[PDB]
Design a binder for this molecule. Structure first.
Ligand SMILES: Cc1cn([C@H]2C[C@H](OP(=O)(O)O)[C@@H](COP(=O)(O)O)O2)c(=O)[nH]c1=O
Ligand SMILES: [Ca+2]
Length: 129
C-alpha cells in the first residue's frame, strides 16, 4: 500500500472526515473500524478524538487498500494518517472504535488493528469499560 497526500477540509465524526484528495472534496470513511454515532455512548469522545488528531496534523495522508476505494455512498475508503500515525489504529487502541466491516480484499491492516483492540480491551478502555 501507498500513502497519498490529502488536506483536511472538515472533521465530521469518529470515523468520517472530509478531506481534499487529488484536489476534490471527498468524505472519507475509515477502513476496518466503527465508531459510535455522535448520538451514542462514546460517540462524542470518538468524534473529538479524530477531530483533534486531524486538525492538529501538519500532514494528512490517505492510504487505499487493494479493493474498493469508494463505498455505495460515494465515501472514500482509506486508512488515514496524521503526521504518520494511523487514525484508524489510534481509535481502536484507545477503545473509541471496534474493528469492524472487515471485507475481503480491503483488509491489509486487519491484524494490526485487532492487536490494538486486544490491548484496549485488556486495559478496559472506553467502549471496553
Ligand atoms: C467501513 C465500510 C462501510 N461500508 C458501508 C457498510 C454499511 O452499509 P449500511 O449503511 O447499509 O449499514 C455502512 C456503515 O458505515 P457507517 O458505520 O458510517 O454507518 O457503510 C462499506 O461498504 N465498506 C466499508 O469498508
Ligand atoms: Ca459509525
Amino acid at each position: 500500500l501507498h500513502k497519498e497526500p490529502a488536506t483536511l477540509i472538515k472533521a465530521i465524526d469518529g470515523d468520517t472526515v472530509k478531506l481534499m484528495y487529488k484536489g476534490q472534496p471527498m468524505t472519507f470513511r475509515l477502513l476496518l473500524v466503527d465508531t459510535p454515532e455522535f448520538n451514542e455512548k462514546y460517540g462524542p469522545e470518538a468524534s473529538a478524538f479524530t477531530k483533534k488528531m486531524v486538525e492538529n496534523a501538519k500532514k494528512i495522508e490517505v492510504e487505499f487498500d487493494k479493493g474498493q476505494r469508494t463505498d455505495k455512498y460515494g465515501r472514500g475508503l482509506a486508512y488515514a494518517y496524521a503526521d504518520g500515525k494511523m487514525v484508524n489504529e489510534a481509535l481502536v487502541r484507545q477503545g473509541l472504535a471496534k474493528v469492524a466491516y472487515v471485507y475481503k480484499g480491503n483488509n491489509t491492516h486487519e491484524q494490526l488493528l485487532r492487536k490494538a483492540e486486544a490491548q484496549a480491551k485488556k486495559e478496559k478502555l472506553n467502549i471496553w469499560s
